[PDB]
Amino acid sequence: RQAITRAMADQARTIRIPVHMVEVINKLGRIQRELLQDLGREPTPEELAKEMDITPEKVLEIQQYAREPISLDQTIGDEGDSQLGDFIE
Amino acid sequence: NSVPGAPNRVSFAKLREPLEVPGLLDVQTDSFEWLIGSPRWRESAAERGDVNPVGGLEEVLYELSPIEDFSGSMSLSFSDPRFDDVKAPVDECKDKDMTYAAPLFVTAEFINNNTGEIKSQTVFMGDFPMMTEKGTFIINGTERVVVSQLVRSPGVYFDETIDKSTDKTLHSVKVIPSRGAWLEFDVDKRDTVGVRIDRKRRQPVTVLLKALGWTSEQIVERFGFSEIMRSTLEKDNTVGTDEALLDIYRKLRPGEPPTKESAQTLLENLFFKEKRYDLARVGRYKVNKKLGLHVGEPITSSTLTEEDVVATIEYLVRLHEGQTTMTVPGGVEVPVETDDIDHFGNRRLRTVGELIQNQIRVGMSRMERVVRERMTTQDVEAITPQTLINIRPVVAAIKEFFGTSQLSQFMDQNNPLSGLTHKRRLSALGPGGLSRERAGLEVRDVHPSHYGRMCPIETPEGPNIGLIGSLSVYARVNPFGFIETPYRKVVDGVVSDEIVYLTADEEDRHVVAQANSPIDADGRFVEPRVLVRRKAGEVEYVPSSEVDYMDVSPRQMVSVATAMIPFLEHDDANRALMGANMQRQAVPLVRSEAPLVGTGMELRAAIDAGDVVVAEESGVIEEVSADYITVMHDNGTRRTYRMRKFARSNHGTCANQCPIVDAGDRVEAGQVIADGPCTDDGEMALGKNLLVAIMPWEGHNYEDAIILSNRLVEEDVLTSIHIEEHEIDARDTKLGAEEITRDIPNISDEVLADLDERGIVRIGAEVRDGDILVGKVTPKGETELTPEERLLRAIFGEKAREVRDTSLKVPHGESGKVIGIRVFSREDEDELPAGVNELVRVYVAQKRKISDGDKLAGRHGNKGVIGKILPVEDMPFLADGTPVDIILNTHGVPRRMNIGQILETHLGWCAHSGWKVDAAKGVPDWAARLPDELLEAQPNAIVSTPVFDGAQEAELQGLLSCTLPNRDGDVLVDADGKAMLFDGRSGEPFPYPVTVGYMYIMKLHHLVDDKIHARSTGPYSMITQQPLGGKAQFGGQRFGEMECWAMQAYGAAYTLQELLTIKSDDTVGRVKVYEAIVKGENIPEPGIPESFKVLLKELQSLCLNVEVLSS
Amino acid sequence: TGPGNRPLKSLSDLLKGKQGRFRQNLLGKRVDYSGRSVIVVGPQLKLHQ
Amino acid sequence: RVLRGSRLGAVSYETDRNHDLAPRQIARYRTDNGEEFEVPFADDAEIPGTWLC
Amino acid sequence: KRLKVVAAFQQSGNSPMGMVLDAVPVIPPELRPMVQLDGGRFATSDLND
Amino acid sequence: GAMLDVNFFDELRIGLATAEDIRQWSYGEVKKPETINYRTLKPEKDGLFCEKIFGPTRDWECYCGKYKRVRFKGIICERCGVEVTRAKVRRERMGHIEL
């Protein structure tokens, strides 16, 4: 299980993130889902910073680090003829 | 008629219809409250039988409950779907961009079988959107409309395609369920059977019946009468049940060890266990009515049965045998007949309740999977349905459906007719249904079952013809998802008044006469031979006794928007289609004047349009404003009605709501109290009434081009207010934060005059193209300076000013006033997306005049751009000095077969002038069928022709004969309908009389500024080095393939090289060409384009040594 | 595939099919120094105008 | 509606001066399996012995 | 049908040794770029996976 | 035979590539499955955007930042290991993977 979690930390993201940041992201997401169930709404970052005992700007930096990239090989149009990358100035 | 605020519009109605037009948004509202389980629905469906009314949510909960562990040792149940109140009002949602919704509370109940408890929590299931009283949904502030979707109903479908190489009819069957598995019982090319299941390519009946568990003798005693089945029974090659089961398991699961017991149960699970195979209640009703199985008992047990399977096979072998009818044992005999995939008995309509129900069912599927998961992994006697239920896939499913879907579209509202047209819309494309390109030609056509149900006129004329129609006026949706249709039933020749909602199959049971049937005012027909419609679309002259149904009115076939065209019966369907399709594309004028000539639909359609404030409760006016009317009810209470003034619609058009009553007025319930965008005095108004002539003038009205008078510019007769909303956000970054302020490095102070202390402009500031709206600057950081810039900053004493300015500049060709500023802030606790600090939106508005190039059209398909706006003097003007307003073309009229515009022109001059026929010798013979209070008419009086009961040739011409003069004794227009015009340019009279009159025309949303587009040097792409395209940018023009063909065909090789290289992809070439132009030098040699080098690098990347050689 | 079972664009997928490099190059290129508008009749003008 | 991005790389604009450059050295690096690589270093630069060629 | 491809390898200066592959090339990265958007939303080109 | 493609084209010969030619084309071996740092947003060494291999992203600026002028051109700084040049050779330069 250690080696498989090592692999899921290393080779599962296109931008490589070190393992401690991956684990605190996973902890943040687990706490976010659990407080979504219990609180009934999506939590505020100040509440999550209260929960994981860090600062809200640290929460925002973790949220910035948690965003996975997107592909340029889907069509924005419902009629599919133009790639998404055909609109980038 | 019979609406208390209706203005006196006079009709030509010869026939008095009993049925009135229903509440046209019932197709949305009743479906949605069916899904809710409103008490309104609860009583209403119970008023037509329906001993057990079940809501859609109630149906999903009952078909899901109970949930069970694999052991059978504990169970979960749901109960009591109840709604809360909404979380915000409508206008507050629409302003603050919150979606309009209401929470769900569901009483769950967990039971341990091992010890025995109930666990009754009240589960917050999640937010749930609500249909507004306009029949729409508001999502994230945007306003969306769910489109109704046609699919084929689940059931048993029958056909044959005879093989021309074989000359044998090949009868086939697709037993299609909902959410199930395929099975088809064909007849092969040989004398065998095609019992292929879920595409497993090859099966006889014997493997299925011994797989069912019949003996050969049990096959014999039912199937006794065909050499077909006897040949297949001698092609059995496997006798014994378990051998057939393992053969099925082999052919179904290959790559799997066989077991004989699970093979019988998996087959029992795949077709009879109703948790993985669920043809609906409608599918069960369709099959049971098709084979006469449950003729005396209501619908349950939504899976199949072996009785139904053997009845299917027997019907198949008799239909491949040739029979007329057959009774199954225990069943009423059904006629041996095949099936259509286009008749409306087979093609149901998934409404919005069906769609939301399916989305909630597929969300609860994943939620149920999670419940099955943590039923075992969690501990026992410590869990609770709070711990069990995760609501996230369900609420994600709902949010995914209301967004990002084929069926969830924007409310297409440039005018309330297009609102009422995007509602009540039928689509055959989407998820579940057929796609566009895979679908053939036959479903695009019009079966005769469309009559009275789906309008055979109104459809888009693009690459969607036939796929998207609308409802008829009087159509209504069956609780089984079919399209029912009213009929006046006629008994013994006497027409009764029992209105009977008939659907498509029971239409074919009977035979139906028409609205233009002569009645003796006591029901009875006077013709012994009457027009009638037979089941296959046949028309006969019936002996006048067998008819059991008559139409409720005329125009029962037609849509709403198409029923707003006078003289429809004179126009061909092509230009009528074009006119009805453009009639949803009118724009709101600043005046909105009612037409002189119309139908009886303009009042009822506008009060059902939503965008007319209707007096809800009868009372008296207390105090008015331009923004609200305080009504004084007749018992106590008072009520305001907040007018929406200058609201932006979804396409830039305005949404003013002016009141139309005074302070002392007394109003009643159901009365119009405030006109909307395209309304006047209650009824519809999509344009203006203009004096028109039909001469060809100077080649300016060449081939549907239209000229105008300058008076339309002078009096603002065609003038719309366009409102455009711009947007910019303050966003976090690594280098700091985006800042909205006046400090905007490098720039004059004069261009910073209109903005406030913090960068945004103030209300009322006229902007041009390319000005500053939101003064906003971003941090950039430090790079090296070029030494020339270093010298210049050394000379001028300027700092670096390290921050970089990206202010919100207004784009090209857009100007006008600035009405309103809505601004959101993260620090002010507003909700914002992530990393965003301040979101400001600016309402920009302008008042566009009419202009040469604008697209105008009448109500008949006669469309066209504006050729030339002539001045007011150079105009063919009438003998009184009145100029004509617009001038159409003659040559476009006869070849387009649309003379309804000519009849509208004659009728419009008749209505403008006003008439009073002579009754000195009584009624003249032409005006006999013409009803009373029509013998006179005041000038500029509103009239109405109903669609298929309108003015005849005798009535129109005879009324045109007597057309009393205006101010002096001036009979301007003769009996023929023409008049003598004078040339405003030359001065001589025209040698021939010219057809004149008043036609009601429209202004369309295909304006010039919305289409003009040009670029010298703008933004490029990122991946390729091509110029970026689209009017949102500066944008380029696709020099396509046939263009390359044409310039090869001239042989202009150098210009082709120009266009392919140094305007597209020669990255080092573009700058040198721009430089050589500005220096005024020779245009240099075109280099190697980028798209070739990309291909070269990809071929080198694909392990292919591409070599380039000169010798 | 990737997210939501959409198959990944391979290297050979750049050249083949609808969005293939050959055909999309053969289809057309948007160009600079161009423009468009709706047209109206010009009945007084010369033929070479 | 318009969306833009940025390849994170600086685009400087000077002239391709072919004549006036900083003068430079060339160091011969050899790998294991008899392969020669010559790497252009600056004059004012210490030449490292080990190298990833 | 075999002599077609056999004489194809024979006549040219090719070698069937290159049919198997030992070193795989890599396309230049600007052809498959990872461009950021406004806010760090990255846009890969699906070859990088 | 001209890869710089100066306008005298006559033929276009497609040919199968040897592994010798493949390693002849490349300017380095990528050997780490990295793209870019999440934090500093600069490309990683031995990755799929490696400026040591593929080239500089900043016009005439090396990775370590020792040299930042166009007069410094056609040299390789000993620390960063990058050939300082114009930043469009990343359109042309290929890498390889020894398997």
Ligand SMILES: [Zn+2]
């Ligand atoms: Zn460096």
